[PDB]
């Protein structure tokens, strides 16, 4: 019995590989050679956020590009005003080892997670004025790696248990679960349409999951080592992954294969964070070399380097309106670039 | 400037003052990471220090200074990821069962992996060889010989500069010193000297256990200061 199952699995894998290779008529590089080059995209630091005490691990932009939430390994969530630099709120967290934070699409709620396995959603519009723990949902058997809001009532969170789960804030229980990953889930990103979401795990693979249907539609295995970060392409048809090999890989959710592999010899440090600009041309990826590099999605060449930090760039993000870029590092300083 | 903007700047200054105030309490308390396999008696060591939670925090004050010991034992077996969060920490407490020769190899391998970690190449590792009484009783009974698992033990001689405690059987002292030397050699392997190991022998009734952690943390902080002040 088990032998037949193994043979069937091997045959299915071989068939999938053959079908994927058959669609490789031409690489994205060959098609992106006639387009003009992006040129040296030089960037300057506009704001310096000296408020955080300890390593800044995660940050996210709200619906308004002027609001900025950031989490540090000291248990503090500081809401930053990117224009005037004024601190809007300071939330003393219960768990000090927070690794992820999220800003709701409505701006009224913010979530976070870490080694405590608990996700405490903080309401910023409380009638009492002071921020209060709205729903401290739990149930995961591992550290939380990433959190993203689908709506004011639903929130999806990834955990080291190798299974993602979509939670109902009102009910406070697991609405649906997503299983199949072999390694701990490292990152998660929502599509622009909120229909599908993609997450990466410790294994060298990434899968696409549907919000309505609790099942994966596609699976990618083009990575060579542990995949750390993942981000959806601005159109929702493709995504890029960061791994511990100094090479970014752009995966398409329609061709089901890697389009371009952004790699360089001198770059050997692992990728910690990845993000996309509103136009998708400028692909920003954070490296452990205490600096961030910009990669042209089409030309695949290095568009620029952000070396303003002096420690591992742990997180980065582009505003929704396309006006600035934020970067976080373990040096407790968050710099905004434009 | 508008009144609303001025009040917002005032609130931002208040939040900055609060953050600066909390910074003192943060930098004043020392954070410690507790690591060890399921077979290790780390639980007993934690319970003794009375001076699905993926994280367990333990605050204990010793010599007018607070120590924050964090232990992770309710997560998946793989740890190469969440171990990175505990960088820039004061010290790492590694507990190993010196009595169980079977799991001893696994403990040595885990200690070697932790020591050679890229992100922990600057964090000192405090090593407590727990269950010394069990190891002593086992080596006295003669039923389980270390040679069956480590052939080098047979050709290992007790260190000349050793200081056997009063009432310690020769075999027990030799075995514990062999384990100590093995751990020190595993730590020195590819060691750049940026961090140092602090091996100590602990028991299940020993009351003077927190003093060892205090001394190790003090020495680590002194070395870090000497490094920052460009004195060494």
């Amino acid at each position, epitope marked *: 019995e088990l032998d037949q199952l193994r043979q069937e699995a091997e045959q299915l894998k071989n068939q999938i*590989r053959d079908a994927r290779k058959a669609c490789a008529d031409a690489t994205l590089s060959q098609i992106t050679n006639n387009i003009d080059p992006v040129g040296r995209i030089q960037m300057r630091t506009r704001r310096t956020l000296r408020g955080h005490l300890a390593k800044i691990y995660a940050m996210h932009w709200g619906t308004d590009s002027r609001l900025l939430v950031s989490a540090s390994q000291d248990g503090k969530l500081i809401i930053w005003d990117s224009y005037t630099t004024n601190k809007v709120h300071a939330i003393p967290l219960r768990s000090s080892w927070v690794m992820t934070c999220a800003y709701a699409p409505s701006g009224n709620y913010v979530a976070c997670g870490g080694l405590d396995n608990i996700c405490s959603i903080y309401n910023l519009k409380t009638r009492e004025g002071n921020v209060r723990v709205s729903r401290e949902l739990a149930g995961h058997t591992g550290y939380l790696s990433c959190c993203r809001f689908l709506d004011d009532n639903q929130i999806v969170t990834s955990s080291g248990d190798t299974t993602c789960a979509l939670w109902d804030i009102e009910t406070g229980q697991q609405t649906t679960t997503f299983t199949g990953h*072999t*390694g701990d889930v490292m990152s998660l990103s929502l599509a622009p349409d909120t229909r599908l979401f993609v997450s990466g795990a*410790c*294994d*060298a693979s990434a899968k696409l999951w549907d919000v309505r249907e609790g099942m994966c539609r596609q699976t990618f*295995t*083009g*990575h*060579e*080592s*542990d995949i750390n970060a993942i981000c959806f392409f601005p159109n929702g048809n493709a995504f890029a992954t960061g791994s*511990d*090999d100094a090479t970014c890989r752009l995966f398409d959710l329609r061709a089901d294969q890697e389009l371009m592999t952004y790699s360089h010899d001198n770059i*050997i440090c*692992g990728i910690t964070s990845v993000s996309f600009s509103k136009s998708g041309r400028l692909l920003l990826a954070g490296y452990d070399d205490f600096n961030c590099n910009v990669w042209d999605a089409l030309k695949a060449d290095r568009a620029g380097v952000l070396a303003g930090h002096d420690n591992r760039v742990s997180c980065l993000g582009v505003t929704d309106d396309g006006m600035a870029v934020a970067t976080g590092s373990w040096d407790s300083f968050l710099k905004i670039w434009n | 400037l508008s009144a609303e903007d001025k009040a917002a700047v005032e609130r931002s200054k208040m939040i900055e003052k609060q953050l600066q105030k909390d910074k003192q309490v943060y930098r004043r308390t020392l954070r410690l990471l507790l690591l060890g396999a399921d077979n290790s008696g780390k639980s007993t060591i934690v319970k003794q220090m009375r001076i699905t939670s993926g994280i367990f925090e333990t605050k204990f004050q010793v010599d007018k200074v607070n120590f924050h010991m964090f232990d992770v034992g309710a997560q*998946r*077996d*793989e*740890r*190469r990821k969440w171990i990175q969060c505990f960088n820039d920490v004061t010290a790492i407490i590694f507990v190993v069962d010196s009595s169980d020769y079977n799991r001893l*190899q*696994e403990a040595l*391998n*885990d200690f070697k*992996s*932790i*020591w*050679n*970690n*890229r992100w922990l190449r600057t964090i000192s590792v405090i090593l407590f060889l727990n269950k010394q009484d069990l190891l002593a009783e086992k080596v006295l009974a003669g039923k389980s010989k270390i040679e069956d*698992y*480590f*052939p*080098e033990f047979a050709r290992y001689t007790t260190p000349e500069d050793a200081t056997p405690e009063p009432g310690e059987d020769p075999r027990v002292t030799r075995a514990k010193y062999f384990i100590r030397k093995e751990f020190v050699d595993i730590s020195t392997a*590819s060691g750049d000297g940026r961090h140092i190991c602090y091996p100590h022998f602990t028991c299940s009734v020993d009351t003077e256990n927190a003093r060892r952690i205090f001394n190790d943390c003090k020495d680590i902080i002194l070395q870090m200061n000497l490094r920052e002040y460009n004195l060494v």
Partner: nanobody
Framework: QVQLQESGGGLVQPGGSLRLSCAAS????????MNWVRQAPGKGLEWVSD????????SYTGSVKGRFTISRDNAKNTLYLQMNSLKPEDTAVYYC?????????????????????RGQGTQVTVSS
């Protein structure tokens, strides 16, 4: 797609000699460190030896020191573990393992629960 392949094994006589041959594809084998682990019926994973990228650094476990010899050939992306002598105790499935990163010295492939970069394993039954 990263995938590992293993060859060699079966039944062997006590004190005999046998070589385990494994291969991998989908990554720069020359950059990743290789380790070996065994799993006997009822016992967990046990590390036996490892070999660095260039092979300049090699180590063996006390229970297998001297009897086994590990080697690698980056020219064809192959790993070898030569066993000159065998005892009834070493009867176990030998699993090959890869380093989690191509430019690091630390390894965590000893996880007994699951690991994404280990082979399928080949049984080695040694007995009279």
């Amino acid at each position: 797609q990263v995938q590992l392949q293993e060859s060699g094994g079966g039944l062997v006589q006590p004190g005999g000699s046998l070589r385990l041959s494994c291969a991998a594809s989908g990554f720069t084998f020359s950059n990743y460190k290789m380790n070996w682990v065994r799993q006997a019926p009822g016992k967990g994973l046990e590390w036996v030896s490892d070999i660095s990228q260039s092979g300049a650094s090699i180590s063996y476990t006390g229970s297998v020191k001297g009897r086994f010899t590990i080697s690698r050939d980056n020219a064809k992306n192959t790993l070898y573990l030569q066993m000159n002598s065998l005892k009834p105790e070493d009867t176990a499935v030998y699993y090959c393992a890869r380093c989690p990163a191509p430019f690091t010295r630390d390894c965590f492939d000893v996880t007994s629960t699951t690991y994404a970069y280990r082979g399928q394993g080949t049984q080695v039954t040694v007995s009279s």
